[PDB]
Amino acid sequence: LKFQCGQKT
Amino acid sequence: IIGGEFTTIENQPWFAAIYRRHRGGSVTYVCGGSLMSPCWVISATHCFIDYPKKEDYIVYLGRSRLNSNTQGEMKFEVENLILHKDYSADTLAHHNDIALLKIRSKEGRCAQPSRTIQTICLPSMYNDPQFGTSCEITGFGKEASTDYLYPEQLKMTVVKLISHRECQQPHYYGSEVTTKMLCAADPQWKTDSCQGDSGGPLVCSLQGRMTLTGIVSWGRGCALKDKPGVYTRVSHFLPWIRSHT
């Protein structure tokens, strides 16, 4: 959606 | 990477592949990088030092392979190439080995968030994990220092951070390592970063986040006993990054 630094999905 | 496992970009979605175009039709891989914010990628200066012509590099995000496509990948041009002033190289180390690449897509945009494209976090001022922490490095570098080609699939491995005291021991690197560098090795010297991995990230968890603690910079050989991999200490460059981003 928007960037969330550090997250993997 | 020596040892490691093969992965896909979903596991490192902030990793950037930097290639160079040649007046001949071929594009070759140069070094790896990481996405800090939608338009900025960070890597190492020594990766550009010899041919600082921004117009000749291409940056891909969302890429699990080296020369074949991955669906969901994005290609960019380097709108700005910022290398470090004070960058030095000696008979081993590279000092101030950090670089910034501002990217622009052929439509006027920066990176867009997906399952294969995400940013990585920066530490806070001079804040690092304690030596011992296991961090992971990723990239398309060599799998043996004697090979002459790079792998086609992305790889990753986990290595641990060691202290400067340990890395500056005479039989390691002496005073070639400075406080603006960090050393990381495998206790049993089995896996390590290698040529072709430069510019790529050393990620560790810090205060709960997956943070970019180091940038692959140099090392004697690859996975050599008492020859740790040396990385740029990102937490010490925050002011520099900031004045440009």
Find tokens 């692959």 and name the residue.
Answer: B216
Flag whether residue B92 sits within 8 Å of chain A, measured between CB atoms: no
Count other C-beta atoms under 10 Å from residue B196's C-beta: 24
Count other C-beta atoms under 10 Å from residue B178's C-beta: 14
Q: Where are the domains of chain B?
A: 1-12+120-235, 13-119+236-245
B118/A1 touch (CB, cutoff 8 Å), yes or no: no
Classify residue B208 as left (phi > 0), alpha (psi -120 to 50) or beta: left
CA B182 remoteness from chain centre: 13
Residue B57 Cα distances to B15, B52, B102, B233, angstroms: 16, 9, 12, 25
CA B20 remoteness from chain centre: 16
Instruction: Give the integer Cα–Cα distance in Å for A6 and B118.
Output: 7
Looking at residue B91, its amino acid is T
Resolution, expressed in angstroms to one decimal: 1.9
Residue B97, classed as helix, strand or coil, is coil
Residue B154 Cα distances to B15, B110, B215, angstroms: 10, 23, 17
Whose CA is closest to B223, among B170, B176, B184?
B184
Superfamily of domain B13-119+236-245: Trypsin-like serine proteases (2.40.10.10)
User: Which approach determined this entry?
Assistant: X-ray
Flag whether residue B133 sits within 8 Å of chain A, measured between CB atoms: no
Classify residue B207 as left (phi > 0), alpha (psi -120 to 50) or beta: left
Looking at residue B128, its amino acid is D
Query: The domain B1-12+120-235 is classified under which CATH number: 2.40.10.10, 2.60.40.60, 3.30.565.10, 3.40.50.720?
Result: 2.40.10.10
Flag whether residue B37 sits within 8 Å of chain A, measured between CB atoms: yes
